[PDB]
Symmetry: D2
């Protein structure tokens, strides 16, 4: 059984050795990164089922990210397996300012009335809370009375009862008991704070990633198609047109514009943590299911992310709720599941990938019976779409061990993936950009091949590579799909059902 | 293109003797004109006849041999090949001659008369004698309460008692009617043990095989044995290519239909005799059931007899006849047949043209009203998966044509069975396979050189389709085959090709 | 129980005059023997005739009136009620008498002759004159290239030129044939401005309404206005219960089918005239399409003319005719019709019996082969939900009978439209609603006293069904109604009951 | 919007007042339970959506248990809504024995070799752990080499490496660093230890509960139909045949015998806690989905229980994973969701019930598009199936506000509930036992009424009670379904679609 659901693992210090020291050891940050020893740790994550590594530019500097990318390239060589490289942008942020007198935090009681300062370069007082806004942006004009200001992952709520134009301050009433600590995340739901579509930090981070060599960009806090289009303009301008963009839907404006965002993007990353703060908690499961169904309808890639196996950061076993949550992401029809802190900063990065691989493989067995996505609903206009449907019907009607597609661009692999056939998909391609770019599509095993000289040669190569890969053995039935004639840019128009010899 | 195939029975109706047309006096006086007759037969081929039926029920071997030769010339004039089908005489019961050379007698309802079972004797007014094929004694096979029907079921005699001394049936005339000499007799629901293959029929088949035929229609099939005995002769004479259609005409054949379909290559629904042998209201029931069951087995079904009966004497068919041909197509028939309308009628060409027009009109309603259902077939096999995919492709896109390169014709029969909304061009490498596909629904058989590889095979499919005028630049076709094309393998490859 | 209804046309074939039968000498001189004629008509009722058609194309009001009176006696003898349907004459064109009192002339293909439009002149071999209804001048309504068809479409005349000086058409004979005096004329694809309702049809309808009828079949309906003018007379005279069947006989009626179906209560598919007025191969196409659309509208369709035509002179139908009646049932027709077979033939009782047998046998195949599909209807209202539920019960379980108590017949018509796999007993409170349901598919109309509560309604439904002999102890029935049944409300209640 | 998914809340000190002392107050346990004060707290749980309370008879003497039941009866009057009374049996257990010398516990290192004794009535030593087995069974022949012995809710693993026939001891190896304390739960996965059906005290506990008036029994650790049949025999012999039995599926043998258990029982409680210990963690979601489908197919009640909102035991909000877990149990097709520690011993018992109610109501809105149960799948060849299917089709085809049934036994209500119509089900019954017995059926609102005199009266009562309950108003469409005549135990045979006046 091959794992059809792809795993995105976030890389961090958890797998990194410095001067023989492991993360958390005293003096760890005082040593140079040990590249070959760290690469051996990352190869184990590849072997356990990580299909793509996420480089989170929210933390660290470019030199750390570049070294990490170099460590993965060595790990691919050690493991003898390739992975996708995904860049995650920092995006806009609002943080709690510093407190006067060096005070770490203040505890507040419901009904207590305090103020929120929009002026930048000011410290916070227990009475008045100061906001560090990205770009030192003035948000006073963009928050309406009745809005909510939430502090530290939505734990504390301040209702905006009044605005004082005299000091550009928010007059709020505490809604629930809690603590306001310094440098804490702030979210103001259902606001349209005018952070620019593409900030200079995000521009630097994307151009750096593009130069290092990446296959995917996950764009943080996408609110409209423009946030996707500004990034696409950079990929096309720099001659990186192959790079695929995943919009991170984390707030109500993003949900409101989901159809236009899906059209612009190559996929969606569902960020459940931030989405849970920005929208009513009971709607997250609704938005997750709806987003997965719509992205699959568009033949695009969806990643379910954040809070998947979070307890495995500190514990070797996940909770029943966490196992259920990952399992149900697969049944919902996700292409990929993601690990953040569990793989980047946790005590059990290898166990976290292994656990997610085990849940994903188990869930894939129920996809035939309990799977939510339904291929019959699709509109098959293009001949290529018609062929993908026939492949799906073959895998439904007969015991098909593998679907083999010869694809110069990967387009046919993506169309077959979209139908969720009851078989693994071997995508034979001729360049590394296409190979790595298919690493997050459901069920796709990308592999490099030699070019066929004829249609008969192509059928022979398809069976030979499947056997050499260990995917099938004599008596197994496979479906082979290709554009004929084979040399040219002929779209996939041929299907053959073959018994492996 | 007409997807439903037409079988036309040949007879004197199209033959020119000297310079005289059928029905002119002294016609039988004149010698047969081969070239003039072939020109007329060619007109039937252009009109849409796909196979000619040689009825060994009438005429002799010399007569059958001369007509088969005339069709071969007609193929050349027309420039289109047709199938050759032999229809056997098979088992019959006829009324005997009357003593004193009387022609016939009339009877009234309620009269008590007798039917003799003794063979080689003459009838009398009071005692009708039967000429049973093989001079069988049928006295122990007919029970009291059975019915004896004379002259195409017109006059009924109810068996009320049996007389062991004379071995006679005591009968009651059920209706006013006439019993004439040499008229057909039917005893429905009886198992008269006619041999599986009689010597006369064995003889006729061996003669037709010698002349060269593609199909045999076996009259009055009652069990698989009847089909299997003819299969043995075809195999022994090196004629394994011949396809056998069992003619279902009576209750015993209907009761053993599953075993007969398994033994045969197809079924000819003989509505004339079936309407006598079973209740008249059951004929539409058996026609629909047989067409469905034959299509389920992937074999050929012919709907035959009285399709455009009135066109034997009149230039236009009845509303009922048009409805009957049309509904045969809707039921899912591979082929419709003409007997007297083409064999000895006043309008043989008009009958083929009328049948072709109704058949072509009916094929346009198959998508919405068609009674066959391709989704009903088992889909856990490579073959069923490919055919289903091909049918799905023709439904989802506007595919004009399905093309196959087939050594044996299996891919063509497989696609035909699924009844795609497209013509099927079957490119084959021998004349035996080519004429053998002439009665398969939607199949246009064509001869070509075997291809050297899968790419060559794809190129030949597109080239022949364009050459035949079946498709043009920018048209989409589906090419289906068992690769490799030289080997004999299950259909396993499909390609949707945009004709450039 | 026969689900498909039979319309039998009454005529002299069942009527005995002073002990004489139709055709014998001085038959028309004798007064009609009412009791002897009523006994003959009662046998047609017992054989399965559900409605009698009185064709006002032939005879006078006195002959029609005495015939309608005779049926009332036949209902008493049979112990069974029947519907009364009036068929209008409508617009006609007939060839005129010839000079020298010649009866007819024979013509050959390619001959050139003329057709006069002037009214009140005799024909010559060279110049055919017409009797157009109302003495309408049709010269401006017929374009060159149109066809003039004579005698049930047997002889075709192509209009090749128009002479403005004599207002004559120059025509070319298209086929060998005869023009006889007083023969029907059809000019396909023309819009001759016959009134929407001619005075003669107004007189015939008002006469029938006075006598007491349940249905009117309106001849040659071209637009909804033809239906609405008849509806106005029915409402004006207090005969708003009377249901109108539009006869679709020509291209204009087919072109306006959707508006005609909305105006009428049903459609009579007049295959005879339709086969002349449209291409012969399209008649089956229009027949299936019309049956589907009328069923979709929840209205009644009658398939008419030439169903068992040969039974006019012969005691058995052809295989094609049996197939034709059988497939009308499979297409989804509510009713089949007999014209000359029952009105003027030698075998009126046999024709009704043969049609009943075919119809009964065909209904057993509706589940597997029926073209109508109740799943196609939209299901967003209570009435559609209840009918779909009744149908599902008859599909899922072995339901013998659906029983409704209905003031207006709405629940019966709704269930009939869904074609359940069960007979429908419709218990109603008045003879007009009862007779008005006699052409709906599967409905057995019966009179009953209105119930005093829902519990009383349920016991009456079971008690009448058991006493009618429709179901027996342990059979399951479905009871459907608009509770409370005394009011005219939407079908809203269903019960599955095991009969005691 | 009426909550269709039912909530079972476990009773505990968290809502209980003792001598004016709230839980976690010094001298709390010394005080008597306060009936009136506690009833006011429990009433709030009822208003928030609790449909049944779960009682455990092991904590406190019967006098006190009687008091606790009296409080809930008082709370019903206060909230103005009736609730079901569920008793949870202790069931058979293995517990670690006392240690010699009063040692409370010992700690062990991975790879240590110790022993597990099978002899009964003896003390543990550090190197020889003794067991207290229900029924005083000898388990030596029931546990093969290679089996695992788990101590304290699966926290410490002991692998059986060998067996000693002279002492009848298991030689085991410590799998992970941990503690073995006295009186701790022991699990031996994939074994068929033939435990008695009930704990020694369960027979007395059940008999007391039946005297007090309970509607449901949840039978712990059911492995065969035999375990359900023993409890049924107690119910029938005391004249309490109305009591519904829920089998708790906690182990592999229970899953293997699921068909026979569902047949013997009135429902299944999926005990995810014990199941998580006894079967591989990744299979729990598989078994949860299969159990929900099979119980629904049998027209019986399923309860999904354990760790639904566990973090709300100590924190005011649930994790994203917990919200997802509760939501997906509804989509899977569960009749009810259950709270244990969250309502029994937690800091936020009321908030736990409100949060579960919010998630369940939100999830029921997605059942039409994403629900995994498939009513079309059911056999449709009987009158009862035909009628239920017609009601479901009516609610699918039309805007049906309510399905109303008048039922003597509750059969029509359980039949409609099984089909999961897109409407609430108002079940009018004639006795309190039938009314309380329907409290856990999906979407059923049980209500008391007088028997009708005729079919027309039954139709009038159905509409009038619905209007009175405030469930519908004039112009709303309702479906009325019943077995006429409703005075008898007849099969559902009548349906009417009625516009409310």
């Amino acid at each position: 059984m091959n794992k059809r659901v792809k795993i995105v693992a976030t890389l961090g210090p958890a797998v990194e050795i410095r001067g023989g020291k492991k993360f958390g050891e005293d003096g760890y940050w005082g040593e140079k990164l040990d590249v070959e020893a760290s690469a051996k740790n990352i190869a184990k994550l590849i072997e356990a089922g990580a299909n793509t590594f996420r480089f989170n530019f929210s933390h660290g500097d470019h030199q750390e990210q570049g070294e990490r990318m170099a460590t993965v390239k060595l790990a691919e060589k050690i493991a003898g397996k390739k992975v996708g490289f995904l860049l995650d942008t920092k995006g806009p942020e609002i943080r709690t300012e510093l407190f006067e007198g060096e005070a770490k935090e203040y505890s507040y009681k419901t009904g207590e009335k305090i103020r929120v300062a929009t002026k930048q370069g000011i410290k916070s007082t227990r009475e008045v809370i100061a906001l560090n806004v990205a770009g030192a942006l003035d948000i006073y004009d963009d928050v309406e009375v009745g809005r909510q200001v939430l502090v530290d992952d939505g734990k504390l709520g301040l209702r905006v009862v009044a605005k004082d134009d005299a000091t550009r301050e928010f007059e709020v009433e505490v809604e629930n008991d809690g603590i306001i600590a310094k440098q804490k995340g702030v979210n103001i739901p259902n606001t349209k704070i005018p952070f620019p579509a593409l900030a200079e930090r995000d521009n630097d981070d994307i151009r750096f990633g593009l130069e290092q060599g990446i296959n995917f960009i996950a764009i943080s806090f996408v609110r409209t198609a423009k946030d996707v289009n500004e990034v696409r303009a950079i990929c096309e301008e720099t001659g990186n047109g192959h790079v695929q963009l995943f919009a991170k839907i984390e707030n109500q404006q993003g949900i409101d514009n989901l159809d236009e965002i899906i059209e612009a993007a190559d996929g969606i990353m569902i960020a459940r943590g931030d989405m849970g703060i920005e929208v009513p908690f009971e709607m997250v499961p609704v938005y997750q299911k709806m987003i997965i169904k719509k992205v699959n309808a568009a033949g695009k890639v969806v990643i379910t992310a954040t809070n998947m196996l979070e307890t495995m950061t500190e514990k070797p076993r996940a909770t029943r709720s966490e196992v259920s949550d990952v399992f149900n992401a697969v049944i919902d029809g996700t292409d990929a599941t993601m690990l953040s802190g569990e793989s980047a900063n946790g005590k059990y990065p290898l166990e976290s990938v292994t656990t997610m691989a085990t849940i994903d493989k188990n869930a894939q067995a129920l996809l035939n019976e309990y799977g939510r996505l339904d291929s019959d609903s699709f509109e098959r206009n293009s001949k290529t779409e018609v062929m993908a449907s026939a492949v799906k019907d073959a895998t439904s009607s007969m015991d098909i061990k593998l679907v083999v597609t010869l694809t110069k661009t990967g387009h046919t692999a993506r169309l077959i993936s979209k139908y969720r056939p009851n078989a693994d998909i071997l995508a034979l391609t001729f360049d590394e950009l296409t190979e790595r770019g298919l690493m997050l599509n459901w069920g796709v095993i990308p592999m490099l091949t030699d070019a066929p000289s004829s249609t008969d040669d192509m059928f022979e190569i398809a069976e030979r590579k499947a056997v050499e890969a260990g995917l099938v053995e004599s008596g197994d039935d496979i479906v082979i799909v290709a554009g004929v004639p084979v040399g040219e840019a002929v779209r996939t128009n041929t299907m053959r059902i073959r018994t492996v010899r």
